Every structure is written in C-alpha cells, then in structure tokens.
C-alpha cells in the first residue's frame, strides 16, 4: 500500500497509495512504471505545500450548476491560510490534478471576490488598475444593470 514522493525541497513523504492515487497525475505515473521501495520526484511541489495536500487527500480518501456555499467545514478550516499558500495549493491541485482540491480552493477564492468593490478586489489581490478613468467609466456604464 505505501509509496513515497519527493518534493522539490528534496524532502521525502511516504504515503499510502489509496490516498496518493487521488492525484490523477500521480496515478498516471504509477502506470508509466512499476505499480504495486523507491521514491518518485514531484518537481513542481515544495514540501510545505505537498505536506498540506497529503493532509487534504487523506481526509478525503473515501468520498463518492455551481454553488459557492457548500464547502465542507473541515476544508474551510484547512484553507484558513495566507493568500500565498492558497494559490500554491491551487497550482498544486493543477499540477497533481486533484479535482476535489481544485474546487474548494477555487470556491474559496471566489468567496473572496463576492460582495466586494472593484477597488477592494484590487486591494485584496494586488491588481494594478491600469484603466484610464474614461475607459473604466465605460465598463462601469456598460455594466449598469447589476
């Protein structure tokens, strides 16, 4: 059941296969060579993030229109991290191709956008306003009806 992954840090994580196989990426790799020993490298993940996604995948090993309010309680608590970490989880979710993680992280970012002002949105995500007043006022007016 057990296998081990190595982050870009060099650090080695040993995890049950069932859990790890929730990363389709990892699952594909195991076919591309011996399934079932010897560690497998994950160059695009650091150990801090990897450690996190191991936690996520373990908690979820069992399991089975777009609503943003149905994030389980455990995941909300799990995603109580800084924005840096949050976006690296998304990238990890991508790289490792774990659809479940990709959703909740994306959902979590979407709720960050909900109920905000264009400028507050920018202040939250460090989005440089480059629009000239004229062209901004244009999309403003263009989006009157909401």
């Amino acid at each position: 059941p057990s296998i081990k992954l190595q982050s870009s840090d060099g650090e080695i994580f040993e995890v049950d296969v069932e859990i790890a196989k929730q990363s389709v990426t990892i699952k594909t790799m195991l076919e591309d060579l011996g399934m079932d020993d010897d560690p497998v490298p994950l160059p695009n993940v650091n150990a801090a993030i990897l450690k996190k996604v191991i936690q996520w995948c373990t908690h979820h090993k069992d399991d089975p229109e777009k609503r943003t309010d149905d994030i389980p309680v455990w995941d909300q608590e799990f995603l109580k991290v800084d924005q840096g970490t949050l976006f690296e989880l998304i990238l990890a979710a991508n790289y490792l191709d774990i659809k479940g993680l990709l959703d909740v992280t994306c959902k979590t970012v979407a709720n960050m956008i909900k109920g905000k002002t264009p400028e507050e949105i920018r202040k939250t995500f460090n989005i440089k306003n480059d629009f000239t007043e004229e062209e901004e006022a244009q999309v403003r007016k263009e989006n009157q009806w909401c």
């Binding site: 777009k66 920018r122 995500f125 460090n126 989005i127 403003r140 009806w145």
Partner: protein, 164 residues
Amino acid sequence: KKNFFSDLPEETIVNTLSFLKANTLARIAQTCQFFNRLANDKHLELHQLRQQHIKRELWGNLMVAARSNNLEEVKKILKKGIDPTQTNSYHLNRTPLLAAIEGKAYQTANYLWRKYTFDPNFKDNYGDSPISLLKKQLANPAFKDKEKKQIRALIRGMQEEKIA
C-alpha cells in the same frame, strides 16, 4: 505582496470565475483589461445575461417603431438579428405585430405578418390577439373608412391564408 492570479493558468481563473454570478463578475470585470476579457467569457453568466439585456432594450424599441408605423426603423432593428415572433412574460406576451395593430400601423403590420410566422390568435397578458384586436378595432366607430378596410384585409389574411 503582488498579483496573485499573475502566475495562474487562465483555464483555472475561469473556473474560479465560474462560481460567480453576473453582479460579481461585473465588479471584477473592471479591475483591469485582463479580468475584463476573462469575466466577459462567452461561457459565463455576465456575457450571457448581457445578451438578454441587449435583446431586451432592442425589443422595447422594436415595439415603439412598430407601433408608430416606423417601418424603416423596424427593419433596422430586425436587421440586428431579433425574432419578433418570440415573446414571453417579461414582455407581457405581446408582439410587435400586436404593437403595429394597436398603433394603426397597418403597413408595418402587413410587413410583419407577411415577413414572419405569427400565431394570429395568440392572446397576450392583457388577453389580446392580433385577430381579436383587429376585430374590436372594426367594431369601433372612431375608426376611419380606409382604416377599417386595411383591417378587413388583414383579418382575412390571418384567418384564411396558408401557414407553414
């Protein structure tokens, strides 16, 4: 302390945006050109509802052009790809055909009747159909002689002519 999405694949930014409804997409659509293009994504609710909105303004205008016998204007709006046969509750189940008729715009009504496929007996949300209105018009003394003639021609058109 710098742009978070900056290093994100566009595909996954859209996915995040897919959770937002038009009001919110609108708000983020005006943070920068980047998010402007992405929030107005063909597949997302902001672009979608903005169509039904553009369509709705055009419908209102078509109604007025039709009612006032402004055939050339009706033709302009129609040329912008609008289906005047398609009505619903928002539009009180009325059609620009019924608009033309009430406005004594019998040339415009003839245009619309001949050029498109309308149900002449379909009552709106006031309970009126092209036929029923044209007929109630005919029973009305305040209607001039040639008007009442243009009408009978139309009633006969809608009652007796072929369909499909």
